[PDB]
């Protein structure tokens, strides 16, 4: 745990549901060791938001790949869904398809009908693992 709960609470100081966002973030970073919490601007330098960036392990063709993603938590998380992206490296390219558009934006039924408390980040990532395992959102 590189980032403490105290540090996370500070990151979401302007959020509407702070502890709920911190709790779910801790759960995610604990289970997914390659996802890191980062305070960054989404689109506008002033639109500071916490996002979980890194990779998630996805089994494919006998091997486990580390798919690069970025999950933006809006200041209304968990009542509104995160905005999710596939972030290909310099050697990777986004694979446009059913659940990923040209910009790498992820589309999932889980996101479209998102409803707290049934929906959460751990559940979302589990779905991503299954979907990406069937069709990797990136290629070399």
- Give backbone dihedrals phi and psi of 65, rounded to 5 degrees, phi first: -105, 150
Measure the CA–CA gap between 15 and 127, rounded to whole angstroms: 26
Measure the CA–CA gap between 52 and 62, rounded to whole angstroms: 27
Domain containing 48 equals 1-140
Q: What is the resolution of this structure in A?
A: 1.5
Torsion of CA 136, 115, 4, 48, to 10 degrees: 80
Q: How many domains does the chain have?
A: 1
Measure the CA–CA gap between 62 and 6, rounded to whole angstroms: 40
Write the CATH number for 12: 3.10.110.10
Structure tokens, 34:
């390659």
Residue whose C-alpha is closest to residue 55's, from 99, 87, 23:
87
Measure the CA–CA gap between 110 and 120, rounded to whole angstroms: 9
- At 6 the three-state DSSP class reads helix
């Amino acid at each position: 745990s590189a980032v403490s709960e105290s540090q996370l609470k500070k990151m979401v100081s302007k959020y509407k549901y702070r502890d709920l966002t911190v709790r779910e973030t801790v759960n995610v970073i604990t289970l997914y060791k390659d996802l890191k919490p980062v305070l960054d601007s989404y689109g506008t330098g002033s639109r500071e938001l916490m996002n979980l960036t890194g990779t998630i392990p996805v089994p494919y063709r006998g091997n486990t790949y580390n798919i690069p993603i970025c999950l933006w938590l809006l200041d209304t998380y968990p009542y509104n869904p995160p905005i999710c992206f596939v972030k290909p490296t310099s050697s990777m390219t986004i694979k446009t398809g059913k659940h990923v558009d040209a910009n790498g934006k992820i589309y999932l039924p889980y996101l479209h009908e998102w409803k707290h408390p049934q929906s959460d980040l751990l559940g979302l990532i589990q779905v991503m693992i299954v979907v990406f395992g069937d069709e990797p959102p990136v290629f070399s």
